[PDB]
Write a protein that binds this DNA or RNA. Structure first.
Ligand code: ZN
Ligand code: ZN
Ligand code: ZN
Ligand code: ZN
Length: 113
DNA sequence: AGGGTTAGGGTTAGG
DNA sequence: TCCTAACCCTAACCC
Protein backbone atom coordinates (compact mmCIF):
# COMPACT_ATOMS: atom_id res chain seq x y z
CA UNK A 1 0.00 0.00 0.00
CA UNK A 2 0.86 3.72 0.10
CA UNK A 3 0.86 5.79 3.29
CA UNK A 4 0.52 9.55 3.57
CA UNK A 5 3.42 11.55 5.08
CA UNK A 6 1.04 13.89 6.96
CA UNK A 7 -1.77 11.80 8.38
CA UNK A 8 -0.04 8.41 7.88
CA UNK A 9 -3.18 6.85 6.44
CA UNK A 10 -2.45 3.93 4.13
CA UNK A 11 -4.14 3.67 0.74
CA UNK A 12 -4.48 0.81 -1.76
CA UNK A 13 -3.21 2.62 -4.86
CA UNK A 14 -0.84 5.49 -5.54
CA UNK A 15 -3.66 7.44 -7.19
CA UNK A 16 -5.59 7.07 -3.93
CA UNK A 17 -2.72 8.64 -1.98
CA UNK A 18 -2.13 11.56 -4.34
CA UNK A 19 -5.79 12.56 -4.52
CA UNK A 20 -6.05 12.52 -0.72
CA UNK A 21 -2.86 14.59 -0.38
CA UNK A 22 -4.63 17.59 -1.95
CA UNK A 23 -6.71 17.93 1.23
CA UNK A 24 -3.65 18.87 3.30
CA UNK A 25 -2.49 21.59 0.88
CA UNK A 26 -3.74 25.13 0.37
CA UNK A 27 -2.89 25.63 -3.32
CA UNK A 28 -5.84 26.44 -5.59
CA UNK A 29 -4.34 25.80 -9.05
CA UNK A 30 -7.60 26.17 -11.02
CA UNK A 31 -9.13 29.49 -12.04
CA UNK A 32 -12.37 30.02 -13.95
CA UNK A 33 -11.59 32.60 -16.63
CA UNK A 34 -15.29 33.55 -16.81
CA UNK A 35 -15.68 35.01 -13.30
CA UNK A 36 -12.18 34.71 -11.81
CA UNK A 37 -12.88 32.42 -8.85
CA UNK A 38 -10.17 29.89 -7.99
CA UNK A 39 -10.68 26.25 -7.02
CA UNK A 40 -8.78 23.51 -5.23
CA UNK A 41 -9.63 20.51 -7.42
CA UNK A 42 -10.19 20.03 -11.14
CA UNK A 43 -13.64 18.59 -10.42
CA UNK A 44 -14.57 21.70 -8.43
CA UNK A 45 -13.78 23.95 -11.40
CA UNK A 46 -15.66 21.73 -13.84
CA UNK A 47 -18.69 21.57 -11.55
CA UNK A 48 -18.52 25.35 -11.11
CA UNK A 49 -18.30 25.86 -14.88
CA UNK A 50 -21.82 24.41 -15.15
CA UNK A 51 -23.19 27.40 -13.22
CA UNK A 52 -22.36 29.83 -16.05
CA UNK A 53 -24.67 27.84 -18.37
CA UNK A 54 -27.70 29.30 -16.61
CA UNK A 55 -30.03 26.42 -15.77
CA UNK A 56 -29.63 23.25 -13.71
CA UNK A 57 -30.60 20.09 -15.63
CA UNK A 58 -32.71 18.10 -13.13
CA UNK A 59 -36.29 19.40 -12.98
CA UNK A 60 -38.71 18.50 -10.22
CA UNK A 61 -41.98 17.26 -11.78
CA UNK A 62 -43.97 18.77 -8.88
CA UNK A 63 -42.51 22.29 -8.60
CA UNK A 64 -40.33 24.70 -10.62
CA UNK A 65 -37.13 23.92 -8.68
CA UNK A 66 -34.09 22.52 -10.50
CA UNK A 67 -31.01 20.69 -9.28
CA UNK A 68 -27.47 19.90 -10.40
CA UNK A 69 -27.73 16.17 -9.70
CA UNK A 70 -30.22 13.33 -9.45
CA UNK A 71 -29.43 12.79 -5.77
CA UNK A 72 -30.23 16.41 -4.95
CA UNK A 73 -33.62 16.09 -6.66
CA UNK A 74 -34.33 12.86 -4.77
CA UNK A 75 -33.58 14.57 -1.45
CA UNK A 76 -35.79 17.46 -2.55
CA UNK A 77 -38.66 15.04 -3.14
CA UNK A 78 -39.00 14.68 0.64
CA UNK A 79 -40.48 18.19 0.56
CA UNK A 80 -43.39 16.67 -1.38
CA UNK A 81 -43.50 13.19 0.19
CA UNK A 82 -43.48 14.75 3.66
CA UNK A 83 -40.79 12.34 4.85
CA UNK A 84 -38.75 13.44 7.88
CA UNK A 85 -36.36 10.51 8.39
CA UNK A 86 -33.78 12.40 10.49
CA UNK A 87 -34.98 12.26 14.10
CA UNK A 88 -33.22 13.94 17.01
CA UNK A 89 -32.56 11.29 19.70
CA UNK A 90 -33.00 13.85 22.50
CA UNK A 91 -36.05 15.92 21.59
CA UNK A 92 -37.56 13.31 19.19
CA UNK A 93 -38.35 15.94 16.56
CA UNK A 94 -38.16 14.80 12.93
CA UNK A 95 -36.45 16.75 10.16
CA UNK A 96 -36.44 16.59 6.37
CA UNK A 97 -32.70 17.12 5.79
CA UNK A 98 -29.71 15.81 7.73
CA UNK A 99 -28.18 19.29 7.90
CA UNK A 100 -31.37 20.63 9.47
CA UNK A 101 -31.01 18.02 12.23
CA UNK A 102 -27.29 18.74 12.64
CA UNK A 103 -27.87 22.48 13.00
CA UNK A 104 -30.70 21.62 15.40
CA UNK A 105 -28.47 19.46 17.61
CA UNK A 106 -25.67 22.01 17.90
CA UNK A 107 -28.11 24.85 18.65
CA UNK A 108 -30.63 23.06 20.90
CA UNK A 109 -28.44 20.37 22.54
CA UNK A 110 -24.94 21.83 22.98
CA UNK A 111 -24.29 18.93 25.39
CA UNK A 112 -23.65 16.89 22.20
CA UNK A 113 -26.07 14.70 20.24
C1' DA B 1 -34.47 31.59 15.57
C1' DG B 2 -35.08 28.07 12.02
C1' DG B 3 -33.93 26.23 8.06
C1' DG B 4 -34.14 27.00 2.77
C1' DT B 5 -30.62 27.99 -0.87
C1' DT B 6 -26.45 28.11 -3.21
C1' DA B 7 -21.71 27.04 -3.77
C1' DG B 8 -17.87 24.80 -2.56
C1' DG B 9 -15.10 21.45 0.50
C1' DG B 10 -13.77 16.10 0.61
C1' DT B 11 -15.41 11.18 -0.50
C1' DT B 12 -16.76 7.30 -3.12
C1' DA B 13 -19.18 4.56 -7.00
C1' DG B 14 -18.23 2.78 -11.23
C1' DG B 15 -16.74 3.10 -15.99
C1' DT C 1 -5.50 1.41 -11.55
C1' DC C 2 -6.82 5.70 -12.88
C1' DC C 3 -10.29 9.30 -13.48
C1' DT C 4 -14.95 11.60 -13.95
C1' DA C 5 -18.39 13.34 -11.32
C1' DA C 6 -22.22 12.17 -8.45
C1' DC C 7 -22.19 11.71 -3.83
C1' DC C 8 -22.03 13.36 1.34
C1' DC C 9 -21.48 17.32 3.96
C1' DT C 10 -21.05 22.16 5.73
C1' DA C 11 -20.25 27.45 5.48
C1' DA C 12 -22.21 31.46 4.21
C1' DC C 13 -26.13 34.04 3.06
C1' DC C 14 -30.66 35.18 3.64
C1' DC C 15 -35.89 34.80 3.67
ZN1 ZN D 1 -2.98 12.56 4.74
ZN1 ZN E 1 -16.74 31.10 -12.97
ZN1 ZN F 1 -40.35 19.90 -6.12
ZN1 ZN G 1 -33.60 17.82 19.59
Amino acid sequence: PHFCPVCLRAFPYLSDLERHSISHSELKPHQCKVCGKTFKRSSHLRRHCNIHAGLRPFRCPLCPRRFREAGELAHHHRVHSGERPYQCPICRLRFTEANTLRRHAKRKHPEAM
